[PDB]
Amino acid sequence: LLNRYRALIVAVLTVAVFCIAAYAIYDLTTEVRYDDVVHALTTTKISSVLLALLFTGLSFASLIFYDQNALEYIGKRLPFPHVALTSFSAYAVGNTAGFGALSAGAIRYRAYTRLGLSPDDITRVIAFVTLAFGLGLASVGAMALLVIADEIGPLISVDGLWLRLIAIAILAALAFVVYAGRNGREVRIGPVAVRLPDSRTWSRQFLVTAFDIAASASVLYVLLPETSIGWPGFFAIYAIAVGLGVLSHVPAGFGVFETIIIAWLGSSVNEDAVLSSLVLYRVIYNVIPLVIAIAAISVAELRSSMRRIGARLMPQLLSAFALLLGMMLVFSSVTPTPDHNLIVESAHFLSSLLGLAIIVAARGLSQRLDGAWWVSTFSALFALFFSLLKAIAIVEAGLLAFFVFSLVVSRRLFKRPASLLNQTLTAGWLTAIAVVCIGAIVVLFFVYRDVAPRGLRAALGISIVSSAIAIPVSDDAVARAVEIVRKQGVADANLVRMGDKSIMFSEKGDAFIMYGKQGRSWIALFDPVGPRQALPDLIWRFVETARAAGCRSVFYQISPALLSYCADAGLRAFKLGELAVVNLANFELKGGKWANLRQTASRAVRDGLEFAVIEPQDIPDVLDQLAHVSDTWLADHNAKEKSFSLGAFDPDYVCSQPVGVLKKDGKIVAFANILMTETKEEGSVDLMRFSPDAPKGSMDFLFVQILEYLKGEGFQRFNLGMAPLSGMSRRESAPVWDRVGGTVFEHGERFYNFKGLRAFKSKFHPEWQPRYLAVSGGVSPMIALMDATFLIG
Amino acid sequence: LLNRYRALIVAVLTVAVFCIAAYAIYDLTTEVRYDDVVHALTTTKISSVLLALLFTGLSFASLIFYDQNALEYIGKRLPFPHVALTSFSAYAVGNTAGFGALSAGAIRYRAYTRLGLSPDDITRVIAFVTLAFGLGLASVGAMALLVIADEIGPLISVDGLWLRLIAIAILAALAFVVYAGRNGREVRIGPVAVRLPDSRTWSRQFLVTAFDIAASASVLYVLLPETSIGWPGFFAIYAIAVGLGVLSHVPAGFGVFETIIIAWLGSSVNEDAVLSSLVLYRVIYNVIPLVIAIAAISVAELRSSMRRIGARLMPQLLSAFALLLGMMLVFSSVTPTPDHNLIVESAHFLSSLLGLAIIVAARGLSQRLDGAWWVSTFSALFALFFSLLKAIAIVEAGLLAFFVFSLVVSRRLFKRPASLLNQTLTAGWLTAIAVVCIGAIVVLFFVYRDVAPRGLRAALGISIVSSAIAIPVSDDAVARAVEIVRKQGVADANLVRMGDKSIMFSEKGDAFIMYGKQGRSWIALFDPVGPRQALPDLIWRFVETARAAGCRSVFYQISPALLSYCADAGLRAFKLGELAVVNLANFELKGGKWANLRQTASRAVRDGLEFAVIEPQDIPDVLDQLAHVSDTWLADHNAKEKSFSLGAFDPDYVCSQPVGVLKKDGKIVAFANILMTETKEEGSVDLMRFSPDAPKGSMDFLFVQILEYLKGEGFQRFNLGMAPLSGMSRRESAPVWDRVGGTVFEHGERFYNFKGLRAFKSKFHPEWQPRYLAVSGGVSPMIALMDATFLIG
Ligand SMILES: CCCCCCCCCCCCCCCC(=O)OC[C@H](COP(=O)(O)OC[C@@H](O)COC(=O)[C@@H](N)CCCCN)OC(=O)CCCCCCCCCCCCCCC
Ligand SMILES: CCCCCCCCCCCCCCCC(=O)OC[C@H](COP(=O)(O)OC[C@@H](O)COC(=O)[C@@H](N)CCCCN)OC(=O)CCCCCCCCCCCCCCC
Ligand SMILES: CCCCCCCCCCCCCCCCCC(=O)O[C@@H](COC(=O)CCCCCCCCCCCCCCC)COP(=O)(O)OC[C@H](O)CO
């Protein structure tokens, strides 16, 4: 149920469920000694750990076929070594993090926009993949719970009829969903409206997801020493444990997975064995895949060669690996050894400080900063020679030295400067910090219960991290922005002079992005305007400025050519609508398929309707007639005015650009703003105007003459309007859409008919051009679209 | 591995495996009392039997989706209530019988040729279905054997490594088969050459076959009272028990299924419970589906309405139901009750006699006789009022009275007369009789072991059944057959006068079929010749005459219009090749796409090559030149002559039909036989003749003039040659073909180039016409095609 959590109480409720889960871990693990857990790790039958490596390998092979199946569903057949990597390194993170910037979403985006998909199709790949895992895990858990409510029924002393009956309830619900969605037929089960694929496709997907959950239950089943349950009893436990640990949005499914397995198997087998198998499960299944995903980038970077997809995936992988590294550092700083460096109960507080600093550096590394690289490299080095002095500890030292190795290797990857601390907060990284802190508190209360200042110090360090986490332009800038609009390309940005939109610049001075702030996030207007080389340097700087004041950097109507370095900044693009573009050198007045426009023009030829080519100083002759016709087209919509879209009643902006008129053979009845550039390379309009002198036979010639004059000056093409998205592309959607995409199309049919319908643009036979809205920080474009909307109105 | 058993040692080896299995049943059931088994049937918790009915219902719902999936694979989308019936009544028989006339094969044929498929596609439906069940049962048993070699490992005291290792062996073999057959690529694993379908199709098929085997293991698992194993342990037992009971070709998988489950679960649970669950399994899963399949025909016959498919399926269903009825009669005659009608150890021998008589009547009813109806109806009535007098016995009396009800209902279904006993033997019905006899011997040795004349009497009755199972035409007939060729239609049958082919007739006198005998089977030549109404009456009479001398009634080159009542007789059609037909009223000498023939004719115009229109009495001028040119075209192939195909060196047959010649401008160098009828409705040729005066430029005009003269007399069309089957239709094949179809195509490219290649026929631009060979008795067309072949040569 992605893009439905619209809150910060989701961030609070996630760590609430983790607090309840960790309290239940400490409840269910009373009479176990930490020394006994260390004993059971040190004696664990190395054939069993090798077999756990084998089953993790089979699990990630099935995850590769999840995604290859997804790409065969939407027709986009991509080559296989560029899909094995982008879904062996999408589940190496998705099994670890579930945040905005670190999830399956913001890695499929960053690894497929570089690879060659369309952002209207990565939201099909992601959505089919997440329906695949969720619905397949529900079917698999409810079928393997159906066959055995007796091998696991009495283990929690719940009778076999009830545990089987809830599995029959889940299977009846999912059979109802499939039988509703037999042939198309989007079935609205609530907010989310599933539209299941072919029966030949969800069955292949069900095999792939059942082999995934089988070879990921068997990783833990080989590590549990000689249970009183078989394989499938443990498989029905595992498909409830994962089925709740991913249901509660916790990072990696940490606490809920742990507490379900401890609550289920402590009655069966010895609790030290289950803790020693769960810790050695989290290592083998959630850290070894990160290490292999890192090394298969770094080795190919040193030395067939997939350096582009490695360059787009390495910050995400390192930022998801540093978070588990920080969990390991804090959990191994709190658990004691006798010989400790009292460097001058407060001497291992340096190590916990380094661990929390490196997960803050992980939040930096996903944002791909430079201070993140310095802090993470040096903090890992300090942890290296302040943890190697104690013992050998090949897991700790080797894993952390691998982090240092990779992070020295990827220095040339990124040099982007910003302030590591001055970004305020996301909904997810607070959950990361708080899960590390609360898990550390539970490790401390767990360990020193059999045999403080360090506890109070770790809590005070976490509170200091929380406090540090808590821690229109001048007419010269507007005129210089107008000069940048002149001396460069796209003429869409002639909405620059109307004010109300803050304008930042670049260091080169010839590039700008135009703001606008509505809620907890400020948006943009068209696209960064300027030469090509100043745009990617500025597309990061915008988002850095947006996070610098604790806001999200939504975009609006961006180009498909922008995507290749738009998605690198952490921008989930979304399909919005297509912008009608008519090339002018490939145009004829009737041709074979333009004569409807010729007859509509000749409808106004007999009226003799005319035009104006007037100047930026030709205001004082027209202005009160402009006021009265403004009253008319405000009476057309019955008095509701919009910003961010058109030019309002403006004494300067209306007379700013050269405009053009519909006449009463000399008397102004309707006008039109025309928007050019100095470079003569592209021109546009924005507004059409109604009169009580123009019926449906003359909704065109006021604009047809403008098209002919823009042909007459010698422009290359012409950006007329922007249309909402058609019914055939409302057909091509994804399974787990919700009210989000419906209100994308409602925003389409709500704000894009103030100039004309899609068929009205189609009357001019245009070649369409898609425009997107990019959203920062992995948040819902329900929120982003409404932040655009309430800034329109 | 169908169409590879080519023997009677398969029939011997099947009952050998059943003898070993029944001896192992009697071995493993020493200390069990028959009274205790009756106790455990009478106390069996009626909720458990209702739940077994539910799981049988789910199993046959999945069997319906086996076949609906199969019909969606080959594109032929058929309506669903005509597929639910023809695969709820194809597995109601296939789970009971595995013979020639009673299997999935000879019910898919009889229920799809009526329904609307092509016999080149029912051999795709059948073959995809049998690969589906076999390969899916192997994958399912090897996967559910993989997860648990510990819940069922020590039950037979075999260590868990070996039972898991053979499952890894099976899964590695099947993964090798799939990875070989990724994209097309027919992988020859031996005699059988699997070519697996789409990954989107065998996965859906794997779900359907795993839900089948799950809901058929659970029918028996609900009947076993409180095992020491879970569900999936019993599922891994069941997928070995079925996986060997269908591997050994035994009817219903009787003895092998029984002995595997007794051998596996007698060590776990009490043996009386396993016998009481296996008998009540065979009832619920193999007799209740026959009863429902019968009643859903008979009720719809009395009263939406599918009377055609019921009329084609009811004899197969009744003949597979009477066999289990006979097993029940013999097994309930041997098992004793105290009060018995001593009508005057030999008074219940009447009941065993009635049971063996009714399974002989079942062999009659599949062949759809009339004495079969009389013997089966009256023998069931005698069993009714000589078994109802003993006790109530609602299962026995109700089941048998249902048989009497259905068989009175289907009197109007069939009235076909033949001798019920005088058919000699099939490979399968001897296995039916012998499995009933040996199972009866084991029931007798089982029951009277705790506490004979009846045993010796049952053995003598079976030996009497075995002994009773052990129990060119005149020139008037040839000339009358030539008169039937004259006064009626197809001119293919002008091979009638050459002798060597026995000619039977009909009772109406104006219809005939022409024999030819090679091995243990005699074949036919073209098609029954005559009016339409005398053909279906004769198409049964041919097969009755063939079984009357203990032989199989193969056909050769039959029409697609014959299939609708050809498949009713029990004739598995097979695609053979297409017969080139050129309509003459829709023909032009060059048109747009015939001018190659015009230029090839003008190649011989400058030679001035000519023809003959000579008579049946114009022999004595040409005959020695015919002898020398016969020496030439015997020197063409280098001296190897064929029967059954053309006219040989014949003093009567060569001069019989009007022939036509290639000349040395008057001197005979090459001839051609031309074949007409009196009705002027269709004409043909058979033989083209080589000369040492005709190169590749004149392989045509000798025949082109014949085509023009057959146009000139005024015929409708022209049966020139018969071509082998093309490469695109050697592409459209089925998965479990073997050397059979390969030698069908080898027979094609081996015997059909003595007149010309497929492109040689394509030079004349023909409209193709498929011709089939029908095979009786469910036997392989390897055998039938070679019986045609060694009668050609
Ligand atoms: C207590 C009562 C509550 C019940 C109410 C149920 C309502 C359900 C409504 C649906 C809301 C879903 C919201 C989640 C959205 C989200 O968060 O995003 C999408 C997610 C990520 O998918 P992602 O791509 O990120 O992959 C993640 C993989 O890595 C996981 O990782 C790990 O946890 C690893 N440790 C293990 C790896 C495993 C193999 N790789 O997918 C989803 O749809 C999640 C839906 C899951 C639904 C499960 C339903 C419950 C199952 C129980 C079965 C029946 C038995 C009942 C007995 C009680
Ligand atoms: C002891 C060592 C020997 C091993 C050697 C293996 C070689 C295999 C070579 C393959 C030859 C196949 C020859 C059969 C051909 C034939 O006869 O015809 C095709 C059949 C019918 O198909 P049909 O359409 O007729 O349906 C039938 C349904 O009704 C059955 O009925 C019943 O029995 C009911 N009582 C139950 C209904 C169940 C649900 N409905 O299908 C086939 O391919 C048969 C192939 C089966 C292959 C199984 C392999 C072994 C499985 C074991 C798994 C691994 C574990 C190993 C541990 C030891
Ligand atoms: C009700 C089920 C619902 C549907 C789910 C069905 C899914 C089945 C698919 C399972 C595939 C993976 C199988 C993993 C099973 C592990 C079995 C196992 O326990 O391993 C034992 C031994 O394993 C081996 O010897 C090697 C097994 C290798 C399995 C390789 C699988 C290949 C076949 C997979 C099928 C798919 C083929 C394509 C693969 C890409 C070790 O156990 P143990 O004796 O150590 O246990 C005692 C105690 O627990 C302490 O350990």
Ligand SMILES: CCCCCCCCCCCCCCCCCC(=O)O[C@@H](COC(=O)CCCCCCCCCCCCCCC)COP(=O)(O)OC[C@H](O)CO
């Ligand atoms: C390792 C596995 C390999 C792959 C196989 C996986 C296939 C799983 C699919 C199974 C579907 C059918 C499930 C049948 C399980 C039967 C469970 C059972 O035992 O029934 C119990 C109770 O059953 C019920 O209460 C009702 C169960 C109804 C199940 C209906 C299945 C619907 C869901 C099927 C999934 C598909 C959905 C579409 C269906 C067309 C009765 O047991 P008991 O307590 O009597 O046992 C004690 C002793 O044995 C004596 O009996």
